[PDB]
Amino acid sequence: LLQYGSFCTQLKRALTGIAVEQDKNTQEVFAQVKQIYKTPPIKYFGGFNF
Amino acid sequence: ESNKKFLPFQQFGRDIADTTDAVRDPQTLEILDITPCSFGGVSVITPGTNTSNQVAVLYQGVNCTEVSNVFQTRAGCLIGAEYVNNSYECDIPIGAGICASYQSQSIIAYTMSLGAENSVAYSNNSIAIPTNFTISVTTEILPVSMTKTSVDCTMYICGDSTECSNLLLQYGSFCTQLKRALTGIAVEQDKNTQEVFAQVKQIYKTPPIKYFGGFNFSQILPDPSKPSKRSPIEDLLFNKVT
Amino acid sequence: FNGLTVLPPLLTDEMIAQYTSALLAGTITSGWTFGAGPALQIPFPMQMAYRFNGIGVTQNVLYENQKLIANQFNSAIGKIQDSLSSTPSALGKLQDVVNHNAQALNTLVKQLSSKFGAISSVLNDILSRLDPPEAEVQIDRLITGRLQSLQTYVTQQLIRAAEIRASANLAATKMSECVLGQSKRVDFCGKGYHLMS
Amino acid sequence: AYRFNGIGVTQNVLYENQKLIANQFNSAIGKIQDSLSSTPSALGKLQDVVNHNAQALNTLVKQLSSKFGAISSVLNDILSRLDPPEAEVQIDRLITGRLQSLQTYVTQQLIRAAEIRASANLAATKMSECVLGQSKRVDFCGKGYHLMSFPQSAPHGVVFLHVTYVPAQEKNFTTAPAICHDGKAHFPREGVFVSNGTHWFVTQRNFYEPQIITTDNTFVSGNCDVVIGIVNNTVYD
Numbered sequence A: 001l002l003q004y005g006s007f008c009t010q011l012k013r014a015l016t017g018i019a020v021e022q023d024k025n026t027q028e029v030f031a032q033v034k035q036i037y038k039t040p041p042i043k044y045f046g047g048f049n050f
Numbered sequence B: 001e002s003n004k005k006f007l008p009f010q011q012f013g014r015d016i017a018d019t020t021d022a023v024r025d026p027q028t029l030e031i032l033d034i035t036p037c038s039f040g041g042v043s044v045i046t047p048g049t050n051t052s053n054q055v056a057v058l059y060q061g062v063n064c065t066e067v068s069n070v071f072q073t074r075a076g077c078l079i080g081a082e083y084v085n086n087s088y089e090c091d092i093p094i095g096a097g098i099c100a101s102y103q104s105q106s107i108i109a110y111t112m113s114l115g116a117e118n119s120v121a122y123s124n125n126s127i128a129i130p131t132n133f134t135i136s137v138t139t140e141i142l143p144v145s146m147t148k149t150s151v152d153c154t155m156y157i158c159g160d161s162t163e164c165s166n167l168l169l170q171y172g173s174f175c176t177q178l179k180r181a182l183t184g185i186a187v188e189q190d191k192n193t194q195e196v197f198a199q200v201k202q203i204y205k206t207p208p209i210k211y212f213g214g215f216n217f218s219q220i221l222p223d224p225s226k227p228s229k230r231s232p233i234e235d236l237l238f239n240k241v242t
Numbered sequence C: 001f002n003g004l005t006v007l008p009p010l011l012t013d014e015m016i017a018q019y020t021s022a023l024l025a026g027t028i029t030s031g032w033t034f035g036a037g038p039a040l041q042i043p044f045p046m047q048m049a050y051r052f053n054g055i056g057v058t059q060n061v062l063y064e065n066q067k068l069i070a071n072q073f074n075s076a077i078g079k080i081q082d083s084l085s086s087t088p089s090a091l092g093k094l095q096d097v098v099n100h101n102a103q104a105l106n107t108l109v110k111q112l113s114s115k116f117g118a119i120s121s122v123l124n125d126i127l128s129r130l131d132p133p134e135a136e137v138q139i140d141r142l143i144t145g146r147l148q149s150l151q152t153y154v155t156q157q158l159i160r161a162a163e164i165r166a167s168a169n170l171a172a173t174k175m176s177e178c179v180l181g182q183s184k185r186v187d188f189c190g191k192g193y194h195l196m197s
Numbered sequence D: 001a002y003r004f005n006g007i008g009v010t011q012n013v014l015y016e017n018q019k020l021i022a023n024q025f026n027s028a029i030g031k032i033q034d035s036l037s038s039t040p041s042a043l044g045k046l047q048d049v050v051n052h053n054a055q056a057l058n059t060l061v062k063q064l065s066s067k068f069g070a071i072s073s074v075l076n077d078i079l080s081r082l083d084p085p086e087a088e089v090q091i092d093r094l095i096t097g098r099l100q101s102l103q104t105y106v107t108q109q110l111i112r113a114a115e116i117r118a119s120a121n122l123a124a125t126k127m128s129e130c131v132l133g134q135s136k137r138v139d140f141c142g143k144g145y146h147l148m149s150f151p152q153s154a155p156h157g158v159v160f161l162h163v164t165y166v167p168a169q170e171k172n173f174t175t176a177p178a179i180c181h182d183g184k185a186h187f188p189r190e191g192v193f194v195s196n197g198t199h200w201f202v203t204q205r206n207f208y209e210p211q212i213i214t215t216d217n218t219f220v221s222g223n224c225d226v227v228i229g230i231v232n233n234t235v236y237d
């Protein structure tokens, strides 16, 4: 197999790029804010459930 | 040991993947399971060589028994990294919620911290109103086009061999398709820039006197002194990209 | 698996849930003010009055019809769980990804049993039954077939990843525009006049 | 002033703060060059294109020296050394390998071209909307309230400079939905009722500027026996 060439390096690079892109997708979609807000202990908002 | 009730006439065993995973000993009739021996990748965690010279090793998808010194994660066995309780912004991602960093100086592994805890004092007769403002400027970078290329089949594959070309022409017309694809790519590359930049039909010019009520546009307006007629920011961008 | 591995994601489900809870708390207790600077407190009825005023209806319409609006909102929220549970294929989009991944992996592992015009499909049998000078002829066919299978799999994975990235970009834009503010684009954040998400 | 008026702030806010805004804009523009220069990987997107193209070409050229299961990797030696009825069999392996390499390269280029075209379309849309006008889409032309933008050109790409508006220095206050007077409810036209502890004013939403409550910035439209949380105070005329 060593005689054929360098297809394996290309395969590995493609798969690694795919994985990095997969992580970046979630990182971009969800990590919008940089603060972690917390809802007040008393849950009264004028008559609305949440 | 196995727990599969072989009928008195089978000898082997398979699965969905159609691989051997059972066998019967000839001398003593007994059912035995076959499992592959452990294997996995190896990843090396290191800071920049300009800083230090130590490394850490992660064996993906293996517990530490098969191989500070040792620590078990959800991604594998981490060797050479010390685990702490403090949480910081992630530096080098490792696995499921684990990160590593270089902090007298060693390599430590922790759990990433999402952000600073905050709480707003909600009350149903209160409001907050700003009294002061700030003007901010931020950048954004977007690629537009890439390099156009063209390939000649006969020179690349055969060079100057006549018999090689004679055998090559027997295959068919793959090279016409290759040429068409490359030509389409080049045309699209031209069209991308033509669409992005050619938005206006006129060529407006700024007045000679650059007084706009106190606003300074020297860093973005073109510079006539230099021959290339480029703004200083454009010059910096052109020099950084090499 | 023979050389096939699955890597875990970087963010666990607990962290994603924390992100979602933070977004909900911010949009409930601040409105759209936390998406463009510091968060500023405001009572919820005043927020909803502003949001009605943003679509062409005056505030006295809300302030004189608070209970009816609250009850309608509560009932609409309540019906969501039943609507989701009743429809069988409501979540086909998320299931298709898993189905396609499983199909691709199963086909790739199944391809190892093909002969590709050789005496046998097992390397050990070929090695233990022949002489190295007569083994390359058989081995080459298997090598070529398996290389072709790998290349096909990689190309399909890249093609699918492109579409997944496009969908992720659309989702990010929707999160930025419908949740962190009020959208005036038609049919972008629901059918009707948008209020909040 | 008009661009400020587009985001909900009156013109007198700018006209009485021209010098401060000009100085802030000048400093923000000045910091840009240092921000770009100091960070080493600020322009990775425009460098990845060149890196990918160079790497692909290098791999394609390097592939020519492989054997693919043949006597040698050069036709001239294979031809002269061996009899032709071995030659037409040995040439086929090299031909197939090189054709496969070309097909792989072309497919990779097509896949990259699709993504580049998508990025170019996004850049064209951003140039059309952020630069030639004022945008109300949240987080599309920067972070904050959009004011204006300036384009700059880069090798194989474009660079945008977004100018926004960020509030600061907030304060606690007390508010009521409506004001009752002579049994008549009063709602603000544009703004919010606000109190500092003993008096009641009306002010705009994004800047503290109290005003005396008057019949000119309110409308009656109702009664005092429906609204929850109404507060009664005198309204001048």
Ligand SMILES: *[C@@H]1O[C@H](CO)[C@@H](O[C@@H]2O[C@H](CO)[C@@H](O)[C@H](O)[C@H]2NC(C)=O)[C@H](O)[C@H]1NC(C)=O
Pocket (backbone or CB within 6 Å): A049
């Ligand atoms: C919001 O709606 C929920 C669901 O109807 C209410 O919680 C219910 O309360 C009744 C009586 O206390 C219980 O019998 C139900 O079991 C509760 N539901 C659930 C799912 O546990 C809740 O009361 C509503 N909000 C307010 C403020 O009343």
Ligand SMILES: *[C@@H]1O[C@H](CO)[C@@H](O[C@@H]2O[C@H](CO)[C@@H](O)[C@H](O)[C@H]2NC(C)=O)[C@H](O)[C@H]1NC(C)=O
Pocket (backbone or CB within 6 Å): B132, B133, D020, D023, D024
């Ligand atoms: C609004 O914010 C600006 C920016 O911080 C404040 O401007 C500063 O004011 C102080 C006090 O007058 C000066 O010493 C600084 O030199 C000003 N900065 C600049 C860049 O000129 C301004 O004072 C704030 N407005 C109020 C009412 O506090």
Ligand SMILES: *[C@@H]1O[C@H](CO)[C@@H](O[C@@H]2O[C@H](CO)[C@@H](O)[C@H](O)[C@H]2NC(C)=O)[C@H](O)[C@H]1NC(C)=O
Pocket (backbone or CB within 6 Å): B216, B217, B218, B219
């Ligand atoms: C507009 O801004 C530029 C950038 O700072 C000013 O140019 C500077 O002027 C000072 C004063 O002469 C010099 O000391 C600096 O060396 C200049 N910088 C550069 C990069 O040339 C320019 O003077 C400003 N325009 C006006 C009318 O004040």
Ligand SMILES: *[C@@H]1O[C@H](CO)[C@@H](O)[C@H](O)[C@H]1NC(C)=O
Pocket (backbone or CB within 6 Å): B063, B064, B065, B072
């Ligand atoms: C680690 O290996 C031991 C072997 O005795 C086993 O008991 C344990 O479950 C393994 N850990 C994990 C996470 O599988």
Ligand SMILES: *[C@@H]1O[C@H](CO)[C@@H](O)[C@H](O)[C@H]1NC(C)=O
Pocket (backbone or CB within 6 Å): B084, B085
């Ligand atoms: C943090 O330290 C405490 C010590 O009481 C320990 O119980 C806990 O497991 C630590 N957290 C980790 C290891 O994540």
Ligand SMILES: *[C@@H]1O[C@H](CO)[C@@H](O)[C@H](O)[C@H]1NC(C)=O
Pocket (backbone or CB within 6 Å): A040, A042, A044, B122, B123, B124
């Ligand atoms: C909201 O107003 C009600 C009055 O009905 C009061 O009981 C409640 O405490 C208020 N909310 C908070 C968070 O205090």
Ligand SMILES: *[C@@H]1O[C@H](CO)[C@@H](O)[C@H](O)[C@H]1NC(C)=O
Pocket (backbone or CB within 6 Å): B121, B128, D170, D171, D172
């Ligand atoms: C508003 O009041 C709350 C509670 O009194 C306080 O925590 C908060 O800091 C106040 N806002 C500002 C801007 O100080």
Ligand SMILES: *[C@@H]1O[C@H](CO)[C@@H](O)[C@H](O)[C@H]1NC(C)=O
Pocket (backbone or CB within 6 Å): D196, D197, D198, D199
């Ligand atoms: C509230 O504003 C009024 C009107 O200017 C003023 O007379 C009064 O002193 C203020 N009270 C406080 C506590 O600031």
Ligand SMILES: *[C@@H]1O[C@H](CO)[C@@H](O)[C@H](O)[C@H]1NC(C)=O
Pocket (backbone or CB within 6 Å): D231, D232
């Ligand atoms: C004004 O408001 C107070 C408190 O809400 C109330 O007690 C009083 O009756 C109101 N005035 C009139 C004339 O009703």
